Amino acid sequence: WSYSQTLSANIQVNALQRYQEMIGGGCSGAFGWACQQFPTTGLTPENQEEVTKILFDENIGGLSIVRNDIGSSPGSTILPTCPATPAGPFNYQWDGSDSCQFNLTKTALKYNPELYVYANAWSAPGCMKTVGTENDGGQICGVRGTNCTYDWRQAYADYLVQYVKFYQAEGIDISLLGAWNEPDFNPVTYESMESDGFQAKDFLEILYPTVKKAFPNLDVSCCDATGARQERNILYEVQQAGGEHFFDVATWHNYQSSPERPFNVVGKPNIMTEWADGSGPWNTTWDVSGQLAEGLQWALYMHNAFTNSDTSGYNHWWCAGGGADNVLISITGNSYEVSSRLWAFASYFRFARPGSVRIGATSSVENVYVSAYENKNGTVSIPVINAAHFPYEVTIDLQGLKARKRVSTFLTDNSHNVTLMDQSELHGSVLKATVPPRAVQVFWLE
Template sequence: MLTKIAAAGLALAAFSRAATVSVDPHTEYQTYDGTGCSEAFQRSLLVHELAEDSRNEVLDYLFTEKGAGFTILRNGLGSSPNQPFDLMKSIAPKAPASNDSELNYIPLPRNDQYQVWLSKQAKARGVNYIYADAWSADGYMKTNDTDTYGGYLCGVYNATCESGDWRQAYADKIVHYIQDYADKGIKIDFVGFLNEPDLSTAYASMQSSGRQAADFIKVLAPTLEEAGLDTEIACCDGSGWEQQRERLTGIQRFHQAKNLGLVTSHGYSSYPGAPFQTKLRTWQTEWSTFDDLNYKWFTSEGFQSDGLTWANNIHNLFAVSNVTGHLYWWGAAEKNNTNEGLIYINTTTNEVNPTKRMWAHAHFGKKFIREGAVRIDASSGSASLNVTAFANTDGTTAVQVINNSDDAQHVALDLPDLKGCSVATYLTNEDNDLTEGTANLGKGGKKAKAMVPGRSLLSFYVSGGH
């Protein structure tokens, strides 16, 4: 058996060989807006149907520091003429007499599939941004006369319809929707009019090129302004990074980027890569996985739904693609075999089961990073470590260290002016969910040292004195 002195000597020797994580607070990158999720397609209804204790558990997991700490909520702006489960009903489901006629508005159906209720609950728990996005215009406004299976908005480039140009009517509907929410005390900060416009799907969908998106933006922007709304336009939720890049390039070429407030993309068809050529906020607004049901942090099969996989996905979004915000698809959903939710719920038994993917998101949520934080330079000498760092406006610093190797690694955090600081650590892996610890500041307090187990995510949180 090792003596205490010998064991201490081995520990010091290990730290002397520690991988150094170097953080430079003077090298700044993008500003952080937050992380988030959606409960569109009536998943907000499912959450509402839970018993009160279970319902609050889900909401706290999603929107407080007890869980993911999301600060962005993405709602679905409906286009369906009816609302069986899994559809989002329009506020103007019946076609008017003509494209120039006033739309036949109805009150928000079922409080917008309980998205009004969810928005209020999210805001009460500290959500900063509400993003409303339409998957399609109403069918009578489109070339294919249905809100499903793609088709184009009548009146944009190369989309001529016998019924005329429906761009103004669609813009008016979007404004009316924003005003409906305002009447209920909810400000919609960003609004989108497309979802995955490069695809035609059996659910609500509408296709668009960048030029066609520009054709609508130049109608929507003045309509918002004339209504006295400061909601900013988002576009275009491309199904993948390169699909979105193509549409953004078209919008820029046709001089409508000036009317955008937010660039949005998904992570499906092409993995997020090099940053977009824009100074606008950039959010990855939908991404999920579709493999077998999985609660695990790491599997030898390497499932895309593993918690560790999502830790690396989020790291790459911020550190490589320079996003200012990241949103997973559904926050909470019924248990199924597609891994579309971060939390699985059962409205019959009131069970609430978070996945390890949710805990991966928590390391990039408001427990550690607040709105207005700036990503700062962070690097390591180890090929198996992915590291990111964020400086908060209150002087605290968060550093995420992902160990992708099987072996534990000793890490020394090199951050200027650590002396006098408190450095807490938070560990997530197969056996831990944000388990709190304390880093060893070492001799002279120049470096904060900790051990990161294999296949794990460890966050350093530096406060006080720094």
């Protein structure tokens, strides 16, 4: 809702002030959701392509991250049968599908050659765990606080590297490798595995050098905690255990704690690798209810992560399929719907591409939010969020950008999906525009 009133906001953008390098937005097709996106029956191949294009085409959804589950369940793991001991031998199996995640990754790469693939195990194979199953939490055998018949850490590290080798042999490079999902949480009934930071360091000290031997440019994550606080605690313990240099990227989910402060790690980026409305009905609205599932709320949640916790990337939970509101695109039979959450993602990531660097951006109005990003090639994106219920006349002063010639204005609100509104020549270093209520307006500088 909105009403008639106008106020003004002053914004300063400064390319000389430089923060995190951005990675992108994304989503997962784990647990067979990739197969719902690529079912053959129901959704036609043309429509399967179109849904994947909508997500990963730079000009539409703008996403770049595909998060795949390194599966540990029957039919989803590269190690369906374990050897008796870590001495092996190991019989690795690849079916060319990977629960359709290979289809998702290959197709997304077709639409985005800069795809950033995150391969993330939810659990070690059961034989490698204290509980002897991939379900019900438990620990990698061999970390402190365990007493298995053998130490399985090297074997688990080798198994993760073998998963990466399967994708590499198909011509797909993995960018990030993770060994746990939500180690602070035991959901009991599906792939899970628990850890504190001392135990995680006991594994990372074997995983990290094992990975760099095979793939010197493959980054290692820690540790996909359910919330930012839980992630900070694991990071603290990893560093206290001596493992500061046994991971490269801090990963965390937004379910069980949200930050307003950076993470307790020096020289490492962080990615919010999973969040969704896990309980509500499927929802597409931008700003009708004000509920957390809506597109405008997701634009604001991202602004918070990128400006207050220096976050470099952001993932929805699932990409597309069923699961009510856990997807960005709902699929039913041969039909689909796009949530306007995707236009919140695109408002950032259609314009701030991989390798962009967040730069200084301030606003004189508390709920007229701004951030700004400078691509490797010098183009600059300034997503402004007018979270107020009436228009703001913004004045944007540009510093360090005298080389820019043109400005394009894009608008997302209840009647616009990243719509091009205006294109003009820059004839100084000041931009003036009226941003409608409850909207994201992106100023694209070239």
